[PDB]
Structures are given as C-alpha cells and as structure tokens.
Structure 1
C-alpha cells in the first residue's frame, strides 16, 4: 500500500511487497513441471504463443552438459540468471576442472537474487526457475523463487494452474522415484503430471517442450516432432 514503492521497504507486518509482486509474475507465466528418479531428472514445459501466426516462446535453457533449467515469468530475467549459471558452471570447470554441484548452483542463484531485494534502485527478478542436473551425488531437482528461496525436491511445478500437477506428483511420489534406467517412462510421468494443469487447450507438437539429464545422458532439449512420441 504505502510500503510497496520499492524493494528497500518492509511493511508493518514484516512483508516485502515488491518481492511478492515479482512472485505474482510467476503465477501469470505458463506452467512447467520438474521431476526426477535416482538415475535421471526431467523437465516438462508448456510453451505459450502470442497468436496463431506467432511462435511458441521457449521455456527451457541449457546451462552445461550436466545442468539446465526451465523458466516461468519474465523471460529476459531468466536469460540473465541462466547466463550467470553458465558462467559459474564454466568457472568451476576452467579453474577447478570440476563440474559444478547442483546444490551449490542453487546457493549461487539464491545469493544473486537476494542482493536485488535489499538494495535501493534495483528490483527483484520476475521469474521462477526449475533447475535439473546430474552430478557426483546423482540426480537433482531444484526450485528457485526470486525471493531468494531455493529448494531441493523430488518433483514440483510452477506457473499458472501448477497446483494440479504438484498434487499429482505428491500422489505419484513412490512410483516415479523408482523409475530407474528408463528415460521414456520418467518423461511419460512428467507429461501425465503437466496434463493435470491443462484447461481447454491440449498438448500439441509445437506446444510441448521436454528436457532430460541423467547418468549417461547429457542435458538435451526435445521440441517439434521429437516430442510427438509422448503426445
């Protein structure tokens, strides 16, 4: 109300409204799902178009051979943050000959987002990210909020109508975690999860976007007729 003019101002109840408004931009964004087993980690994203003449905005970004994320909210902010991750993944490789741990990647994103919430002049990031990866401790899935909060999960979803997919994953927890050494079945579970967040529209060939990473699988993105198999 009087305390939402900038990010440097707490409300009387201890809230940061600019951060909460940035969180709102994620809810307006298109749905995206994340889930993993012990061998693989999968991203599934519903892409959004402007109209029938337009293309479907890309949702998934590759950060390294073993890591990447999907976005929901302001796409340019995802480009800035994914660019930062690319550099950090790259600094780890060039200096330490070491693939960056997914957990440490989250800690770096948290700290970068935080600086924008405590300083005058700047603004919070207006995007949410789902980071998947495979490192020395196996498969991983992270959820990033621009408040700074980063959370390691078995599965999750963010965006509009994301609650439906999140409930499904909460039921299916014991099943999909056990899907080891079977990439296609893990994607099926992800496609079935994101389907719980659809209304009116359904999953078409240029609508759906899938990504996967695993034990002997580099981070690869599937679009177009490559995802027709899963429709």
Structure 2
C-alpha cells in the first residue's frame, strides 16, 4: 500500500487518497500551536512562538497582509512567506485597480485555488503549512482556517498545530461567551490567551514567548510582542 503511492502528489492511492498532501498536513501538526477567535467587532490571533536554543530567537508566526487582514502560521515558515506574500499582492491589487478592500472570504478563495494547483501537477509539492486568517471587511469580523489540501473554512474560532485540540475544545465550549465580546478587545485577547494555554504542556507562556495580533471595527490589524503582551501573561 502507501509505500507505492506517496512518491508524488500526482498519484492517487487505491483507497482514493493523496499521501503527499497528508504528509504536508502532518508537518502542520508538528508545528507550534496558534489560536484564532472573533466576535462581531474584532478578531484575534494568539500564537505560541518556538525557539531552537536558549540563545536563539522565537520564530515569528503572525504576518500582516494588508491593513484589514492578517494571518498566523503553523508549519513550514518559507511556505507561509510565499502564501502571505501572494495574499499581500491580491490585497494590493484589489486596492489599486478597484479601490476596494479585499473581502476575507475572497482571500480564502484565492489561497484555496493556489494551493490546489500544487496537488494536481507533476513536479511540485503541496504547501507544508497551515494558516489562520483574521480580518474586518465590509461584512464584519472574520476568521479562516487554511489547509494545504486547499481546504479553507470560516469559523468563530479555532486552533492548529501541536496539542491544538486543547484550545479547540475550550473554544468550542466557550463559544456563546466570546462571540459576544464586542466593543471590548482586551476580553477577546484574554479569552484567546486562555484557549491557547489549554494546549500548553511544556512551559508557560512568557513575554518573548507569546504573540498576539488583532483587527476590528476601528483597529487596523496590529501585532503585539514582548512587553506589549505582558499585560496578558
């Protein structure tokens, strides 16, 4: 089985699977955890940064695509750079040509389509990274989950990476609670920091270990690192 069908993405298994893609999805789980949750006014991204030594920095995991959109990564950093950069252009295009801010639902469509192209042709490899996209457009706050398989989904909240299932349950239970945290950003951010620690195990989120990003009604997607997140640790 598998052995003979995971040579490349252009091959289907007898059961009907695409192993190369599943292996890609695997690199995601092996990646550090990150969480996403939104209300009706804001959307927040909380991510756990990872480091090699104690002399090394913690790999950033939040990327800003435009003024009303951004995302968090889990997996291969390079691929997130490629994808966020492709999304940065798509936003820039929409602004220049149509003088319009790109709908978060449409950003997801573009990502899905770019990722799919890499799973049907010989020679290329699927992207090995997962993305959580937040953004406040013309129809409110939004949160999306991107899978290298090309599957993008709109949620109220979610998490991806190692032990990500902890936060995902906390949130699936805390739903009715944060979905109403409108008008107040500090509550969504605290709720986010909580859901994320549900997936901890090794250490406790420190200052240069935590990373939070937010966007909303009157908040242009901004990133918080270090001392900036101290008041949430």
Q: For 1:224 and 1:163, how far apart are their aligned partners in 2?
A: 26
Q: 2:22 aligns with which of 7, 15, 20?
A: 20
Task: Output the CA distance in 1 between the equivalents of 2:108 and 2:41.
Answer: 20
Q: Give, in whole Å, the separation in 1 of the partners of 2:147 and 2:83.
A: 12
- Paired with 1:11 and 1:201, the residues of 2 have a C-alpha distance of 40
Question: Could you list the runs of 4 or more consecutive aligned residues of structure 1 that deviate by over 3 angstroms after TM superposition?
Answer: none
Q: Deviations over 1:58-108 (max 9, x none)?
A: 000000000000000000000000000000000000000000000000000
Q: Spell out, residue by residue over 1:190-216, the C-alpha distance to the aligned partner (whole angstroms, 9 max, x if none).
A: 000001000020010000000000000
CA distance in 1, matches of 2:189, 2:63: 18
Q: TM-score w.r.t. structure 1 length?
A: 1.00
Equivalence map 1:172-191=2 (5 Å) = 172-191=174-193
Uncovered stretches (5+) of structure 2, i.e. residues with no partner: none
Q: How does 1:20-59 map to 2 (within 5 A)?
A: 20-59=22-61
Q: What is the Cα deviation at residue 140 of structure 1? A: 0.1
* Structure 1 residue 44: Cα displacement: 0.2
Deviation at 1:178, TM superposition (A): 0.4
Q: Secondary structure at the match of 1:105?
A: helix
Aligned length: 231
How far apart are the structure 2 equivalents of 1:31 and 1:135? 26
1:122 and 1:200 mapped to 2: Cα distance?
A: 36
Structure 1: state its 5+ residue gaps: none
Q: Report how far residue 148 of structure 1 moved.
A: 0.2
- 1:137-163 CA distances to partner (integer Å, 9 max, x unpaired)? 000000000000000000000000000
Distance 2:119 2:204 in 1: 38
C-alpha distance in structure 1 between counterparts of 2:73 and 2:50, whole Å: 12
- When normalised by structure 2's length, the TM-score is 0.99
**Structure 1 residue 109 displacement after superposition:** 0.1
The separation in 2 between residues aligned to 1:117 and 1:4, in whole angstroms, is: 12
Distance (Å, rounded) in 2 between the aligned partners of 1:163 and 1:205: 23
Rounded Cα–Cα distance in structure 2 between residues aligned with 1:19 and 1:32: 21
Cα distance between partner residues in 1 of 2:169 and 2:53: 30
Query: 1:173-200: per-residue Cα shift (whole Å, max 9, x none)?
Result: 0000000000001100000000100002
Aligned partner of residue 119 in structure 1, secondary structure: coil
